Amino acid sequence: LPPGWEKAMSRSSGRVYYFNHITNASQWERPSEPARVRCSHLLVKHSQSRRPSSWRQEKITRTKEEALELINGYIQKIKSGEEDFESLASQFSDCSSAKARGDLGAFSRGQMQKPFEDASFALRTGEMSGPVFTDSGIHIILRTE
């Protein structure tokens, strides 16, 4: 397999799947570096976030465990097609980029928080991350270019 990916076995069905420990993506299909990428994200903050505050909520009090549950729920809805990433980012991202459907614009290595950067540059175009953790909170990242 490519770097970043490993083969795993579903705990519930026993079927082979693939997991990326850089992006925290997981998928059933066997997966097949850019100078700059463009990403959107949805951030869910928690009480240990660097700044436990956002446009949504002046005092963010949720636990990091509660923040992860919210992230996992949004990922489920996005993957089911029940909701679009853009819709959920606009409504629920704890960051002012919510106003741009989560878009952060284009960037190179050396700009973003490292876990976010590493996930961003390891995603394929159009691919979405699993939960990514930074000092800001927990992120869902969508690489758009």
Pick the CATH number of 36-145 from 3.90.1150.10, 3.10.50.40, 3.30.70.360, 3.40.630.30: 3.10.50.40
Catalytic residue among 39, 40, 41, 97: 41
* Annotated catalytic residue 136: yes
Given the DSSP bridges, would you call strands 5-9 and 16-20 parallel, antiparallel or unpaired? Answer: antiparallel
- Taking residue 7's Cβ as centre, other Cβ atoms within 10 Å add up to 10
* Annotated catalytic residue 120: no
CATH class of 1-31: mainly beta
Residue 58, Ramachandran bin (φ over 0: left; ψ between -120 and 50: alpha; else beta)? alpha
Q: Considering only CA atoms, which of 26, 142, 46 is closest in space to residue 85?
A: 142
* Annotated catalytic residue 41: yes
Resolution (A): 1.9
Contact call for residues 46 and 137 (beta carbons, < 8 A) = yes
* Annotated catalytic residue 139: yes
Catalytic residue among 39, 40, 46, 95: 95
CATH 2.20.70.10 residue spans of the chain? 1-31
Give all strands of the β-sheet with 16-20 in edge-to-edge order. Answer: 5-9, 16-20, 26-27
Angstrom distances, CA of residue 96 to CA of 20, 53, 69, 126, 143: 28, 11, 22, 22, 18
- Where in 10-102 does DSSP place strands (E)? 16-20, 26-27, 37-44
Quote the tokens at residue 58. 């002046």
